[PDB]
Design a binder for this molecule. Sequence first.
Ligand SMILES: COc1cccc(-c2nnc3n(Cc4ccc(C(=O)N5CCC[C@H]5C(=O)O)cc4Cl)c(=O)c4ccccc4n23)c1O
Ligand SMILES: CC1(N)CCN(c2cnc(-c3cccc(Cl)c3Cl)c(N)n2)CC1
Length: 480
Amino acid sequence: SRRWFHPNITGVEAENLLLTRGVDGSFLARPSNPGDFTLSVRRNGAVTHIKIQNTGDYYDLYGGEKFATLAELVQYYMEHHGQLKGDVIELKYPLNCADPTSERWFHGHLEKLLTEKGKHGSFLVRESPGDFVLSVRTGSKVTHVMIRCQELKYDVGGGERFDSLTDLVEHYKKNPMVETLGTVLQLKQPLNTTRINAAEIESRVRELSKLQGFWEEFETLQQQECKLLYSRKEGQRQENKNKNRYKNILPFDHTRVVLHDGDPPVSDYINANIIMPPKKSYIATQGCLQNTVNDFWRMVFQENSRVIVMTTKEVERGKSKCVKYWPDEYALKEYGVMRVRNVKESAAHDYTLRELKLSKVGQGNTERTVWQYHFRTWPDHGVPSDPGGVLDFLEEVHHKQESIMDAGPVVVHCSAGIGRTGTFIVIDILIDIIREKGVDCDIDVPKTIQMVRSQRSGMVQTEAQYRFIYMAVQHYIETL
Ligand SMILES: COc1cccc(-c2nnc3n(Cc4ccc(C(=O)N5CCC[C@H]5C(=O)O)cc4Cl)c(=O)c4ccccc4n23)c1O
Ligand SMILES: CC1(N)CCN(c2cnc(-c3cccc(Cl)c3Cl)c(N)n2)CC1
């Protein structure tokens, strides 16, 4: 559960929530300078507020570490005590939020939708005078159950009195209401309201821009990240620790790229994950470290990748984001058992293309061209103000990949390999559907993102990137 995240509270409400309803060790997280977050913790009868910043690459906690998601941050600190501080700050008791705004089924002020979009077990909750309504589709019919709100507690007319709509919903999901004549009011899935027909994107973007709808949709997607805390054990191994750019941003074990090139102790690790929507696939990875450049080339060779997308400069804000893992133009280099030649560099307005020749030392017949698309103009913080640049680049990447018979996954990297990497990958997935199925196709932005996030932690980091994905898809349809 992610109940410790309160979307509509202020620092004062946070202080009062913790002081009157919490104990020492009680905590919550909340949004802010908008785009920022706060971890409010009770310690020795007083409330401490800790800043969490995210400009697009990772959640950066003051006096703490860098994380892929707020759920991974909270999971880590509740499990590993002494890491948050010079005195230590302990996260013991999540202070639960009763607000249903970030719930998939909660539709505030609202049968047409349930009849059109719904199926057996599709449900929603809307607001009635201070009471609520639970609308369910079964089959086929729609049944409305009234939700009474009496003294801050919710009930369906009898039985238990719930402290939140979430507790009521979860209860009647486990224990369904049965009608006298035998209809089981099964709450299988929330009604889908995010799937749109691609030709109607401008209309959805206009509605999401109204007071903003993008924030509510994004925060509801963020609330589902608690279902994605998959094991990341391999990345934690002692021998793998210095192979991670950020110690707490790790690849899921179930999708990590396993290296079999093996020099005969622990030669099978890279901080990278296969992303499936081979030739139609991606490898999402971090910017190389000096000690992972050989592993990077071993991955590229093994997976038969012919295209690399780099979405960072080597250096941003005087900080190294990715080592230069490729030779200078016309130069030849050996990176362990792999040999790379940089044949030619071509400079475009937003990017540089490097034509590389990769082969294994001692084996001539293993040579293949690897095209490196280096996007150089993405801002240091936030996202581009216009997506034309990104789209033109992605179009070029897509055509290069399409032209190469049996090419492996497209390798995509930035610094941590989750924010800009996730953004470019999601735009590419969505645009690919519009290529195949045409403008009369269905697209579901948060569905696509949730699917990518189950393959690598925190793919698509911010609300600014979320909105950029909608703008990029809108611009692609408008230029069709
Ligand atoms: C079914 O799901 C799962 C099944 C099995 C494993 C996991 C699992 N995978 N990763 C994590 N993490 C992240 C993490 C863990 C350790 C370190 C770390 O470097 N080490 C090693 C030396 C000291 C320690 C330390 O820094 O204190 C860094 C990170 Cl980021 C957690 O926090 C975590 C917390 C509660 C439960 C599982 C966790 N879990 C799992 O999710
Ligand atoms: C008004 C409201 N409270 C805010 C918007 N809203 C929704 C609904 N569903 C998703 C969704 C879709 C597919 C996968 C995943 Cl994981 C998610 Cl969470 C979403 N992001 N927002 C509807 C309710």
